């Protein structure tokens, strides 16, 4: 039936039968000064999926940087580490069709629209606000080359399945759950100058619906940090 999950002072519901993807077959564990006061769900503002939407992305350490206590622990520490559980859900009827790829990409270093330059901080991440992929080649001096077909990385978008992911096909499921382990070259790092991974949501089959149906589908992203560690 329906499973109610409570973390801290926040509660969400998921389908009891929903599938969970554990990236690289690894669950987050501790190696430090632990903090479990932030182990709550943070629900990001929902985005609306339209017939023409090209896709959305979030950089994670940055996406939660303004979120109360999580944001404060980043601000009061020199080094830190965390794993995350990401819950992605769609609100759609049986008269809606479409298909999304929900993928977590480690070290998603992005290219600039201008070859001679590097992208700026806001074009790469707008914090808790989703960044948007383009259907066209983008342009600007500090702009990210967000054209969808290359996922902002210069690779074919159809090959992103190499990274932890789940497909959402509205005729069979409206949700995805990804457990993302800490992945880096070092045990702990500065959480403000490095994004451990990027969450990308990319439609592969356009949203479509019957003629009297709602013209958009809300997509909600809920984030739950695990095993957070900081320097003493």
């Amino acid at each position: 039936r329906v499973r109610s999950i409570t973390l801290g002072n926040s509660t969400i519901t998921t389908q009891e039968c929903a599938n969970v993807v554990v990236g690289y077959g690894t669950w987050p564990t501790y190696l430090t000064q632990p903090d479990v006061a932030t182990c709550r769900f943070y629900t990001l503002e929902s985005v609306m999926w339209q017939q023409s939407s090209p896709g959305w992305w979030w950089k994670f350490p940055d996406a939660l940087s303004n979120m109360g206590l999580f944001g404060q622990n980043m601000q009061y520490h020199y080094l830190g580490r965390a794993g995350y559980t990401l819950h992605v859900q769609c609100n759609a009827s049986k008269f809606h069709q479409g298909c999304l790829l929900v993928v977590c990409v480690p070290e998603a270093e992005m290219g600039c629209a201008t070859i001679a330059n590097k992208p700026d901080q806001k074009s790469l991440s707008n914090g808790e606000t989703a960044n948007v992929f383009d259907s066209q080649n983008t342009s600007g001096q500090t702009a990210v080359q967000a054209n969808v077909i290359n996922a902002g990385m210069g690779i074919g978008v159809g090959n992103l399945t190499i990274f932890p992911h789940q497909w959402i096909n509205l005729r069979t499921n409206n949700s995805a759950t990804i457990v993302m382990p800490y992945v880096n070259s070092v045990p702990m790092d500065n959480m403000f100058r490095h994004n451990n991974f990027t969450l990308m949501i990319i439609p592969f089959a356009p949203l479509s619906y019957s003629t009297g149906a709602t013209t958009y589908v809300p997509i909600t992203v809920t984030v739950a940090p695990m095993c957070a560690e900081y320097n003493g």
Binding site: T26, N159, T161, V183, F204, P206, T211
Partner: protein, 218 residues
Amino acid sequence: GLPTMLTPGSNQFLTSDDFQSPSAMPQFDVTPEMAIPGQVNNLMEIAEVDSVVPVNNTEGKVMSIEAYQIPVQSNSTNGSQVFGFPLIPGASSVLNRTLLGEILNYYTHWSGSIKLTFMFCGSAMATGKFLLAYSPPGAGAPTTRKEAMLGTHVIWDVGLQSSCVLCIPWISAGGYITCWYQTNIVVPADTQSDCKILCFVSACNDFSVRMLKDTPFI
């Protein structure tokens, strides 16, 4: 000292050799390895991951995500072809930029089996049947739905299964994959657009490669 003779091959540099060499920094204390998730021991671990196949890679679709979207129309002529493609290993146009294709393009010779998955992305209440047919190497692609029906095939009813999986050999005409509209797609209500099919490919089992070469994509 000990009597020795130098043989042919002495003092030559073979770019392929394997000899010990002195360290420039023998006294350096090297940083220990830590576990990192995702260790890769073999490239077949990548070739075996399903990736999306750009089946609808027509001239005006290659620069769009639409290259991966096979159109399905509810008012098609029954028995007409929905899609199809050559399983030609030499420059497979729909399969050579896939995770599988990229790896196989680093070897001069390879052999194994391929898994092809077809996923229907229409509405939940949409129903109808498709004919997925396989044409062995040297047989030729079928020209009609009946010809395809008398060969090797599966009837895929999207009202029962959102996806269908085929397993075929692939070595290196190369054989063909076709899909026919056995029936059209029946829906409870008008929609503003058509339905799509996504195709995925991966190495199925016991896939092998034999001689490393440069990639042709640089």
